[model samples]
Target: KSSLFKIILLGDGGVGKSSLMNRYVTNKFDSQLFHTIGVEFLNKDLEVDGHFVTMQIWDTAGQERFRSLRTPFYRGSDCCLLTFSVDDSQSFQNLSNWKKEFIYYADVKEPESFPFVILGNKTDIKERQVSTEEAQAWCKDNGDYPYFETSAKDSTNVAAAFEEAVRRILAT
Candidate 1:
């Protein structure tokens, strides 16, 4: 069977959500790629586990004010990435808020079983406040969704986390 899944990235702005997408799809990180005013989706073809799949990722302006634009597209997502940068304390605090927003708008009837992946992006940065234990414990508190500490710039665990999102979709 052909594996195709609709995925999304949801989080506060400046958490490197956009960069993560670009980094995975293009293997390039634009330090100034701030196309956050519009909405769109990009398909990335890659192998997950042992098979090829197309990931249709819905990208949007990731801010509270842009809620309307993001919600419409959230309904079809097979999986989601709740991204937050390590240095951003406020972003980490609202991680659960993002999940709630996604569940409400995505119309997920079975929220408990839905494939939700958490990404702690920006691990390469020196300004660290969020800890691995806190993030993992938070994951445990919230359905134990797969938590990944990644650096889009360093290309660490980015692919693994993205693949795991795909894997969740396929397994379910």
Candidate 2:
């Protein structure tokens, strides 16, 4: 039997949430992609540890205006990717708020135990403001959500991040 998991992506606008999903699911990336309006979905089927799993990935709009619209999709998520642009410090700082919003709206049975993966995207860019140390420290501070620095443009760690998320979900 195949298992199905719902994974949600959350972050501030312009933080590469959509790009990450595209890179992971479609193995494609576009730097000029427009901001997500409310939510987008992609389905990927994979075999993990000999178990076939289907991932229904939801990429949510990060703009504050879409907050209400985005919350509804958070319900029943099996895992969440809290993404941020390495070049944008503000986006990184807002991660906590995103986490809070997800926990509240997801209505997770055990908020403390819910799976969340922290992603520092756009690592291929040289104008980064958030250092790897800083990102790692933040992850360590916040229940140590598995952290990965990815570059959708270069395809670095894009597949690894999503695979790790699935591995985590399967373990739980």
Candidate 3:
């Protein structure tokens, strides 16, 4: 059977939100990509964990200035991917704020039950700012979301993260 899901990625700028989306949907990457001013999206029909899934992936600009462009679209999301660059501590600090932003704008009925997958991106660069333990601990405290370390450049854990998202929504 096939299913449709709307998954949105929320994070600060330069967290590789577009790269991750493009890598998953098209399996390509461009390091010198333009900053997404408002929002962008792509679709993928994938067989994940043996189930057919058509995922409408929404990527948002990390700039707070574009909250206008991003907030209204948060409604009707099946899953939320809260992303942060591993090397950027400020990005990690904003994860909770991003979650709140999504919950409020989306008017999520069940905040406790919403499937939010936290991603620590840009693992290709080795100067880690946020440790895995800290990220996982935050995940445990904040709605017990799943955490993934990914590199859009190397394509590490990118597919698995999305697949886990599908599995989560399916389970729900």
Candidate 4:
């Protein structure tokens, strides 16, 4: 039997959401990809602890105009990828609002702690605006969510974080 997990990507625009998905799911890279208008869907098969699971990944636009459009998309989510830019401070700051929106849209009835993985992307840049410590601290304070620093360009730490997310979702 196969398990299905609905995973949504949330974060500021240009935090490498699309790039990361492309690299992970398709093993391809785009140097000049434009912003996603609303959302895109991709699926992949994975083996975790000897269990095969199918992941339906949804990548949403980071623009403010799509704020009202989140509720429908967020429904039935098993996990969410909250992305942030290591080179952009504002992206890190907006995490709170994003979290709230996710909770609201997902209709989390219980405080059972839904899975949220924070991706600190764009670490390939020389000048990083947000430190790993800051993001970790915020995660600890908020929900002790899992966090990782990644670079879609370098493709560093992307697979490990993604695997961990799937593991957590399946474990729950």
Candidate 5:
């Protein structure tokens, strides 16, 4: 039998979720402007620690109107990328509300054990709003969740973050 792991990319709108997906999937950049209406799916085969892994990546709409539908998409997810923007503090703050909404909608029975990879994106920007320390502290104080600071624009730390998240998901 084959193994498949489900992963969801989530955050406030315009946080570069789509760009990250595209960067990983196609290895090419699209300098166009568009919003992901509902969700988009991509598949990739990767070898992690000598084990074959199949990743089912879902890029979701980060708009408030579609937030209500996220939990359903998260039903069988193995892990979630809780993305925020380092250049935008409001998006960082939105993480709390997003987490609350996830708990509200997901099955509470397993909420505590659900694997999460909290990400602060846009680290390439000169001016920043949420510092990396703040994000790290929040994760530590909240639930001991793993946190990463990344920049999709410069392709910095993106692969490592996703790789670690995938590793964590497969561990369980």
Candidate 6:
């Protein structure tokens, strides 16, 4: 039997949340993708350490207008991927707020111990404003969330990020 897990992707709009999900699930990425209006998801199954697991990966709209609609879905998430663009410093700075929102809405017990993985997307871009060191420091300060710098367009670290989340969830 396969274990089922619900994973949600949260971050500011245009941070490549959809692209990451698409790349991980379908092994394809499109640069012309449009913004996610609400919440969208796809299912992917993988064998982790000899056990099959089904992942319901949710891609949420980062727009402020959908916060009310989005928070409700956060309730039963087994893990959360807090994503941000490496070229967008504002999105990086917003990670804290996003974590707080997830904890509050998910009703997570032991917020500090909840499984969260921070993804710095768009690493292929040359105009990055957020440094890896800075992101690592933030992660260290905030529960030491596992950080992965990925480029969805290039399909870098996409699968590993999801795998890491599942591994952490299973560990918990």
Task: List, residue by residue over 1-172, the lDDT tens digit for candidate 5.
Answer: 1278877888898888988888777766566848777778899788877778899889988888876565577667777888998999999988888787666666644788777889888888879999888899989987888888887777887888778878878768
* Winner by TM-score between candidate 6 and candidate 5: 6
Which residue pairs in candidate 4 collide? none
TM-score of every prediction relative to native: 0.94, 0.95, 0.96, 0.94, 0.91, 0.95
Tens-digit lDDT string for candidate 3 (1-172) = 1366989999999999999999999899998998898778888897887867888999998898899999989998889999999999999999989998999999876777999999999988898999999999999998888999999999999999998888888876
Candidate 6 lDDT over residue span 1-172, tens digit each: 1366999999999999999999888888897998777688889887977789888999999988889878889987889999999999999999999998898888876677899999999999999999999999999999988999999999889888999999889876
Model 2's number of clashes is: 0
Select the stronger candidate by lDDT from 3 and 4: 3
Pairs clashing in candidate 5? none
lDDT of 2 by residue, 50-151 (tens): 778899899999999988889998988889999999999999999899899999888987899889999999999998899999899999999888999999
Worst 10 residues of 4 by lDDT: 104-113
Give each model's whole-structure lDDT: 0.85, 0.89, 0.91, 0.86, 0.81, 0.90
Q: Which ten residues in a row have the lowest lDDT in candidate 5?
A: 100-109
TM-score for candidate 3:
0.96
Flag the better candidate by lDDT, 2 or 5. Answer: 2
**Between candidates 1 and 2, the lDDT winner:** 2
CA lDDT for candidate 1: 0.85
**Displacement of the residue 119 alpha carbon in candidate 4, Å:** 0.5
Where does model 3 exceed 4 Å of error? Answer: none
Q: lDDT score, residue 69, model 3?
A: 96
Summing lDDT over every window of 10 consecutive residues in candidate 2, give the lowest-scoring window. 1-10
TM-score of 1: 0.94
Model 1: per-residue lDDT, tens digit, 59-149?
7777778888778888878899998889988889999899898899888657788988999999999888788899999988888889999
lDDT of 4 at 43: 94
